[model samples]
Target: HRTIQLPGLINIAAFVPGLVTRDSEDLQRVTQASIAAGYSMIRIMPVSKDGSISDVKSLKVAQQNSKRGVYCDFNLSITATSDNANQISSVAGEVGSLFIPFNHLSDNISKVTQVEAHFDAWPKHKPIITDARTTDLASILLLASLHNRRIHVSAVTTKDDIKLITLGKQKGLKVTCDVCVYSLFLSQKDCPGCHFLPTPEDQEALWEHLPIIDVFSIGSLPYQLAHFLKKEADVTVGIADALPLLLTAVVDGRLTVDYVKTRLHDNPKEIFELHDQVGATVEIELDRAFAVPTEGVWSPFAGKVLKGVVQRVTFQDQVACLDGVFQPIPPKGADMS
Candidate 1:
């Protein structure tokens, strides 16, 4: 039994902490769960926004309040809008990154250049992340390469996309991407994946429909499932179950711990520049088993035992979570950048 504490993970795609209620206590609790789950930083973007542009503004509120100046860090990646385009420096500088939906780009092909230019000329030049479909990826990557820009594609759903990303790297194009952990085994023999939990039926349909991609995160709506997926997506998978599920794949011998570290910790931290900054440590028991924490939604993993447990999240030299229990918010104050 080894309890190896890893550098807190950085989830490249996650929801705003307290958008639904806009209450401080709600923000506080969600913030606690997010950090306690062993994530030092999460990129808060609008994957499935109920309030449209509310996600961006709500992100500001959460960012404004910390559990005690020392809480999980965040990256703000907002939806692109024409109103914010000319002020690229203003928008990109404020959040350091941006995001656009793939369909939005696909439907209005002309929008691609504007987005590419925005990301290319980002004040900080941070790579722009997006959820794109397989069919459009080649064109997207080609354009990005031409613009001398970087693209971090998420919810990648095909082996060829992995090959594409690898090829992009070999060819020297700055293209990066991630696949949802569950997709590795979800519809496979073992089964497990998602932030927006598609029904098992949806999962089955997707598996039959596409190949797999690399990088790691939950699924965005399936590229062509407007009618099916509208029936909905998961929120419980932000960070807590992310590692356990990935390690489950490890147990199945499909992936290695090294690859998980690369996708979960290494790649994002290095590019986003948070790897060396010691803010928090998540102690996990790799071989130990634990059950799901809570339930309210349709969770396939609910009532099931997972391979690893986030035993504790040590932050600011304090044991914030022990035995899966989180301490009350520390006195709030120095916002960890």
Candidate 2:
């Protein structure tokens, strides 16, 4: 098995057609911006409307424009089913990781019931990264137990999910899971009547179990780290999506410097074995500043200052000075430029 550590800011961006533009220049610019924000590794997902697989031309362009020391992993976007199973497996062999968005593609019932057979048909070469969507926890765990392949579960929400995952680990399943920072800091109360949000108790449980979890992730939704801070959420900005604000949280004593350091630098490395990539070790320095908003785009972080001072970023023997202005907070009501 490969084992290598990484900085705590690796992120998985769902590079679907409409969510993120397919334009080469836009992709390049976004990649550059993310890199400056302290991401060392990014996972890209290519999605199409008709459920057909798309070529990876845009991914190649993003890689070409990515900072020298950065690494990008591709997710196979094919649906998991009997008809597409063989093709999905074949594509997995060619990609970096197999992405199974069980919830995003279809209803939970059809996907949960059929996923096992889909896996049964899949050839076991690439790693499988998936989400429960609206599926029940038992069904998800059952699927994991049925396979010996390495499995990564994302968007873990409830305490029950955590306990089951822990038990799954004890039973010798090669399964790992992650929790989104958004879920940790925000609750349904933040968005009244939104059943998807976790409660304060849920966030607390997640924090208590963080040491046992494999990785920290960010969802596709846009959110501001600063808002969480204002809410007095026990938040940490270890993942790429919110490192600057995490640094500020560290300064404010809302989070410990050591805790932030471990989560941001040590914990994720252990999970992803990031050290395996050649020339992947990059350097970043954070500045003490607040995030603010800009115009021309819909940013969850708009008008919120992510506190940090970034001085320089070095990757692949190339150094880029960030001029202490990393991850600029976009202005409110800015249209997507």
Candidate 3:
């Protein structure tokens, strides 16, 4: 057997549309790019806007066309008007995960009640992950209490939400939570656009109570690196909606190599329960640096040094490289010469 080492990063919320085109070839290109950059699994959001579910078909097609060894987490969108839990179940059964935007569902009392009524018809065995960024803590808590099995809460911004998730876990609820990297690193004062800010003490608490948390990041490599460097918390920090920045973050010394391996490789496999699988092994070297932008994608990591080279990548006994080289491992019976 041959062995290769990789950074082992996994983007649980890798948004595919904007970073690359939505077509099959482009999707595959992005997938290969993710692999080359050292991502083992990528979770694609099938819903882009409120009250609409247009990306599902395209995303599904992309998932099917993804390269082997790079796992895909498929999400099923559920709205207040969602009448068919059976449909959710069927899609989730096929894709292995579900996405519920609690903010959209809890927009109003009627919508909240409608969502509560709809969950009653869902399959208990399938895993359901909800984005709690825009929803009230109480409503999310109530939903977790009601459907306490296989439910995950993501993008939580408030201390109250974290406390509730902790309590829910104590009560044997199968619910888990994740804090956005932006929230952890930048405060509203720093960025006027930020929605919420947790104090340094609260940040400490999150790291202290890492067991109740499973995922991190809607974006930001520097923030994640800062967290990892401090060794304050041990949780899986996803690349979220950005991939190129993640690579840049690593090159800049914002995140360490060992931490990247753990976050990308070890933590993800445990969180998603991926078994008997091999990941793309990439060799990264830092040789040069780039300036971080004052706005846009690299702004979050502004002034941070961007360095690193992905010299080579190997997956499924096949090797690919930056130099347009491709090779296959010889089988046992193949000629050694």
Top TM-score: which candidate number?
A: 1
Residue-pair clashes per candidate, as listed? 15, 25, 2
lDDT of 1 by residue, 1-337 (tens): 8666687676766654233334435334445656777766666554344432223454465555443243556655556543445554454545645676655443454656656665554543565766655556776777778777677777765555556666788788877776665554454333232334344554554344332233566333321122233422334333466678777667777567777777778887655554354657778887788876556433446677878777888766677777666666563313323
Off by over 4 Å in 2: 1-8, 14-26, 47-82, 104-113, 123-125, 133-135, 223-241, 252-287, 294-306, 324-337
Which residue pairs clash within candidate 3? 8-264, 9-264
lDDT string, candidate 2, 1-337, tens digits: 1112234255654333222233334333334454555554455444432232323443343334332322222232334433455555544544455556554434544666566655776656455566663344556567767666667777777777777778778889877777765676666667655556666676677777876666656554332333333432111222334555555555666665556556544654454444433343433344445444344333445577665654554444344325423333221111110
Determine which window of 10 residues in candidate 1 has minimal summed lDDT. 220-229
Question: Global lDDT of each model?
Answer: 0.57, 0.50, 0.48
RMSD to truth, every model? 5.3, 8.3, 9.0
Residue 275 alpha-carbon offset, candidate 1, angstroms: 5.9
What TM-score does candidate 2 get on C-alpha atoms? 0.70
> lDDT by residue for model 3 over 92-182, one digit each (tens)?
4445455666444434456566556546755666455666543444565577577765567766655666777888788887676665555
